[PDB]
Amino acid sequence: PRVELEIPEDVDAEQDHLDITVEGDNGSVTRRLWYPDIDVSVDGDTVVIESDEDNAKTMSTIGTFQSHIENMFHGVTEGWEYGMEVFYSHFPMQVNVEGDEVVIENFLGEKAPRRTTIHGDTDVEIDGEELTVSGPDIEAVGQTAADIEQLTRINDKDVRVFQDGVYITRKPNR
Amino acid sequence: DKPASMYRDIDKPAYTRREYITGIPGSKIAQHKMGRKQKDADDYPVQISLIVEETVQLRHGSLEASRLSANRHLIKELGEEGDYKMTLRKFPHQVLRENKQDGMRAAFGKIVGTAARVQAGEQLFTAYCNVEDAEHVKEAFRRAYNKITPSCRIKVERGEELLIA
Amino acid sequence: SVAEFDADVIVDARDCIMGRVASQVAEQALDGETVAVVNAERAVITGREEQIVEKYEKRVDIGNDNGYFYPKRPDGIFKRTIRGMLPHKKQRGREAFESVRVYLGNPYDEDGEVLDGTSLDRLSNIKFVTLGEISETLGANKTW
Amino acid sequence: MEALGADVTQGLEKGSLITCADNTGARELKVISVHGYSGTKNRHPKAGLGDKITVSVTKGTPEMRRQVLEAVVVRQRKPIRRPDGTRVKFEDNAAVIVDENEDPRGTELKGPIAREVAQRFGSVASAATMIV
Amino acid sequence: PQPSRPRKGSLGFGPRKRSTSETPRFNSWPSDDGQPGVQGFAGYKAGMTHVVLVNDEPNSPREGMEETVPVTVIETPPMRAVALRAYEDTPYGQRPLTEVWTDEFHSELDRTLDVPEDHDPDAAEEQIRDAHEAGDLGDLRLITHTVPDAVPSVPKKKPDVMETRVGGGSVSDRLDHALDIVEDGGEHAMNDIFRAGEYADVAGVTKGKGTQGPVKRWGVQKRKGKHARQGWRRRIGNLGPWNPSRVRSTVPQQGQTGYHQRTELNKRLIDIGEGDEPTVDGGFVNYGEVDGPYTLVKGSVPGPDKRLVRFRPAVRPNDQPRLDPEVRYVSNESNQG
RNA sequence: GCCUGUGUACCAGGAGGGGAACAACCCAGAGAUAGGUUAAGGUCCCCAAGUGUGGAUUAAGUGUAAUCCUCUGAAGGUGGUCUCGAGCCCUAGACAGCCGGGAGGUGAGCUUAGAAGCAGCUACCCUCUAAGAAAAGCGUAACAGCUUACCGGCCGAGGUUU
RNA sequence: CACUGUCCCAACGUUGGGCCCGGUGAACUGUACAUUCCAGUGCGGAGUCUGGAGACACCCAGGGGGAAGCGAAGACCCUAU
RNA sequence: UCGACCGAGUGGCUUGCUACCUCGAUGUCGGUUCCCUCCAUCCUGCCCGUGCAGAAGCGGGCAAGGGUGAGGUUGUUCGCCUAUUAAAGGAGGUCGUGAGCUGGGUUUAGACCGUCGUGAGACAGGUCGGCUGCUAUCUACUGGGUGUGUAAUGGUGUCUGA
RNA sequence: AGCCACGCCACACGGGGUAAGAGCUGAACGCAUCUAAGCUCGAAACCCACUUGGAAAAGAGACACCGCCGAGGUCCCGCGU
Ligand SMILES: [Cl-]
Ligand SMILES: [Cl-]
Ligand SMILES: [Cl-]
Ligand SMILES: [Cl-]
Ligand SMILES: [Cl-]
Ligand SMILES: [Cl-]
Ligand SMILES: [Cl-]
Ligand SMILES: [Cl-]
Ligand SMILES: [Cl-]
Ligand SMILES: [K+]
Ligand SMILES: [Mg+2]
Ligand SMILES: [Mg+2]
Ligand SMILES: [Mg+2]
Ligand SMILES: [Mg+2]
Ligand SMILES: [Mg+2]
Ligand SMILES: [Mg+2]
Ligand SMILES: [Mg+2]
Ligand SMILES: [Mg+2]
Ligand SMILES: [Mg+2]
Ligand SMILES: [Mg+2]
Ligand SMILES: [Mg+2]
Ligand SMILES: [Mg+2]
Ligand SMILES: [Mg+2]
């Protein structure tokens, strides 16, 4: 099969080997897209994903490549944004960005800060109890958002009672 | 609870003759006729059978567990007076021995029980139901085939076109 | 090691299937040829990395006082693979085997040649591993 | 437990008979076990100064005898080493009966207690006449 | 049914055989974080005495109070770094490339080496710098040796020679730092590498016991009770099960014990002095009197008196250095009596 | 890899060629010597002969294991994947998703203090409509409130059951 | 009860050996071959068959894992007109 | 969380069956000492569920790196019991281990009791006493030497790391 | 004195890759989906780190100097880390 992705306006797409790079006003994302007998190429203003193979496993990856590229289009123009909200019951939780990591102090009264390191060009912006996580690469941003939530995970106590943590609130579309 | 691995094969001669065999235990099978006994099978649009896929011996205790777990489901679903009938067609004619209580001296076994010989492709159970209740008999049969040795096929012998579509 | 082997044949193992090369290198060495296998680290083994790695790990693991000494490094592994295709305890076999050497990278001035049937197409295959990767997993020091 | 502030060579074993130094009415104690202690194959469980031990009353008033209680070892003959390097050793081996809260069971202690036993049990130190 | 218990002795120090080198050879070196500097030193074991010390541990309830600490006195006169060796990075790992030698030699060094009469240092140095430019240069170490003639208690005039790594700084700065040291004649001191209160790893070849049995060598039990009177006292029960039918190397047996290399981690340097302060009345037994450059090591060091021991900065310290701890007292009491 | 029959061929007393080895499994019954051609079984290397040809499947190193004490793998599962059917729906726009609309008699009657689609009994009508239950499921002390049925739009090519 | 190295848990020492040297100087045992190890196979408990692995030769000391070690035509058990 | 009936299996630790190996002997049980292993995990690490508030648990997953100890009765294995413990898991290695130890039990020759027998005697019933050979040829390993090879130029010293 | 333990000293962080597991992006199947391709994490377990042995590694190694009528070594003598 063959699928054609029209590159949108003010976006450039370059393909070197199995790597594809997408540049826009919001930035640049490069991705490895590598699967047997699937060719990904830039022809003019349209990115082309094709294979001589019609089998279920091939179609799966084709559909996956399509969505990966489209997400890259969206990331370099409109950008990707995750909303997040800190909640705590008893102990006030301090959430700040220090360098390339986001740091959480006084979680559940803990003396030791919890840390996670931001992926790539992702930006974390804190305003009061709200956070926004943003960048051009949906992989990096989504993960950075996730890591923040995961960082407040508690295995040993009833989560229904102990709810403190930072949570993803808004999730991106398109 | 002796394992069926002991009894399930047809390797032995047919041993059925009660004139030459005493002390045969009673069958644990409660009834061969279930649901509505006063109603003819032919009154139903749908006929479904459980077919045995390997020639085997199924002992009477296994027949009963199987029958039970199928009929209990029908009763639970269609209701105790529910409109359907189920037949267990086979009877446990083959008498079983165990050499228990000497070793292999005078080894001919004492009489321990009974089994039904079923050839591959035969109908063990046949159920007759209304179109709406057909998935309930399929389900009863699924429970039933888990309680007997062989793999089984579930077959709709009448009114399949009426089912689903 | 650095000894300057004089080879009638220089084989490039880069993106090539190790056993298909080894089979051919074995037969040539028994035919009288002196052989250098080059870029061993970039040689390739098809299949699922996790089971492949378990096998080689098991070989590192097995042993006793008498001993089973299984190479971790890519050149060693390739060498051993070839030894398995030679009667290396017989005289003609040990001679052939000693006429073969495997190298990390390419100590020669000339590029090696790619043997027919041995080459793997990376655009057609994602399930495979490089010898270099196996060695790293085995704990080898990476000098290549 | 809290550091003793002394190195001990345990001088007692499971089965050792030692003095009960207190007014509880127990006179002789038999060591049975050592709190928090795990040994090794063939090794006799060993106890010393500052250990809490489970104990059996071999000699004393009828009502104390045969009773299985807890105690704390306040003196031993085998030397201990103090941080200045000097060694300290006592005239006998002695323990003091203690309850679940490590409060002495009796109202009075008999004879000296080692200073290090205060770093562990306050109530026992408190009831001491002399501390060395 | 048969309580378990750990095996007798460690399998990590084997095979337990005679060391091939009475001068220990460091297996590892500290990291490069610091400024360029020589990564070890050496001296001769004298004996033991003790010391009263002021507790400097911020986390001790005894902090500030006095403590008695055992100390091994080691005579640590200056050594000579007599050459600079460079290693090339190769597919087979590190290999010596070349060496830059001094022309200036201690009088006794010819008891050990064949001393260079003709060497071209600049050619070697050039070869090294070309290697660095190519990015093939993998390591920089100094060939060093001791001056036992400066230690009268030790009968030998023949120097012990050992190679010690130079770490720290950029490679270029390190190279220059190395070259500067050598050209002088290489003379350097314990002062230069180490500061009191720092942790060192001390390596040495242990006191030789010659042949010993499994009881001493491996810590196996003696035969017990009735068993001890039957004709067997110091022998193990059996050399193994019926199968595998062979004796495993893991079963404890008699053999050479002692005279092995050991590297002991995290030895606190209590003091680096000079003079007769540490020396004991009557003289260190089987050694002599110390007057000269010395190092006090907390606790014990591998080897007998007179044995060469080696220092390196700790490669895996547990604690932060507390520098220059206060020594209130050093016992000179006779070790006889 | 058991005891005890029966018919037969084999070992015993049967080489040689296969089968990793191996009494009875396969080829094969064999004077010496010599040249050929096959059998069983093999043809990537070890190892004589193919890295043979035309297709297709498998991703599990499944497998590369005729027979067997010897080579295990079962009942029961599997939107892993490939192939061949049957029915129904669909450019008069299907299937899914998203958006909009899910109305009035009316809070149906009975029961009940109140029973408002949704505790229970019975009924289950009627209008406005493109369509919307006297409510399929959460939800409330009871009403809120969230959906499902059902209709319209966006989109555009297969979908769905078996 | 007393006692104590029976034990925790082992150490050091003493005498005679052991080890090296001169002299004297046997026996047991021996189908052959034999540097083995892991697996397999085989009359089902192999240094020797098969597949691999390992293995430069000779010599000293050791404690005895294996040679179903050496020693004794099994005392148990059955069979013998 | 417990989980019947019935059905399908895996292991080779018990017991039974078979009589294939050894009767010109493969030294018993239990214990001990010393070594290696398996995982169906008792503790410890990381997890999932909970009839998970916490604390303390219960159940489950991955996981064999380390640990899993001391005592009273009994020859006992097993098991019962005590106090400790993070826990005081279970198996295999000729039911590992007598050219290592022990010799309490089974099972020689002496003797008593009970039962049986006319009796000699017997029991699988109880009980007291009742022996432990060998100088290591080969192999195996622990340690120590002498040679040869690397090398048609040796040596001293320092290193590299499969 | 020595030898000894009952005496004294020292004996890990951290990194990498994973299992169970928690997730991200993501189709097949316009939705959903931790998985199919891709990715972030995550065990006392694995690898590195650290200690010990290790030129007989038959690809039998490297460097510097000394020497080939003489470097160096053995024997000898006084001793013992
Ligand atoms: Cl090995
Ligand atoms: Cl060979
Ligand atoms: Cl692939
Ligand atoms: Cl205890
Ligand atoms: Cl013993
Ligand atoms: Cl430290
Ligand atoms: Cl014939
Ligand atoms: Cl494989
Ligand atoms: Cl014993
Ligand atoms: K026999
Ligand atoms: Mg809790
Ligand atoms: Mg014991
Ligand atoms: Mg004896
Ligand atoms: Mg003294
Ligand atoms: Mg004194
Ligand atoms: Mg015959
Ligand atoms: Mg050929
Ligand atoms: Mg397989
Ligand atoms: Mg078959
Ligand atoms: Mg066999
Ligand atoms: Mg062989
Ligand atoms: Mg006989
Ligand atoms: Mg007899």
Ligand SMILES: [Mg+2]
């Ligand atoms: Mg024997």
Ligand SMILES: [Mg+2]
């Ligand atoms: Mg498991």
Ligand SMILES: [Mg+2]
């Ligand atoms: Mg283990």
Ligand SMILES: [Mg+2]
């Ligand atoms: Mg045994």
Ligand SMILES: [Mg+2]
């Ligand atoms: Mg055992």
Ligand SMILES: [Mg+2]
């Ligand atoms: Mg034995």
Ligand SMILES: [Mg+2]
């Ligand atoms: Mg014996």
Ligand SMILES: [Mg+2]
């Ligand atoms: Mg003997």
Ligand SMILES: [Mg+2]
């Ligand atoms: Mg006896």
Ligand SMILES: [Mg+2]
């Ligand atoms: Mg007795």
Ligand SMILES: [Mg+2]
């Ligand atoms: Mg007796």
Ligand code: NA
């Ligand atoms: Na009988």
Ligand code: NA
């Ligand atoms: Na079945």
Ligand code: NA
């Ligand atoms: Na492969």
Ligand code: NA
């Ligand atoms: Na190995």
Ligand code: NA
């Ligand atoms: Na004896």
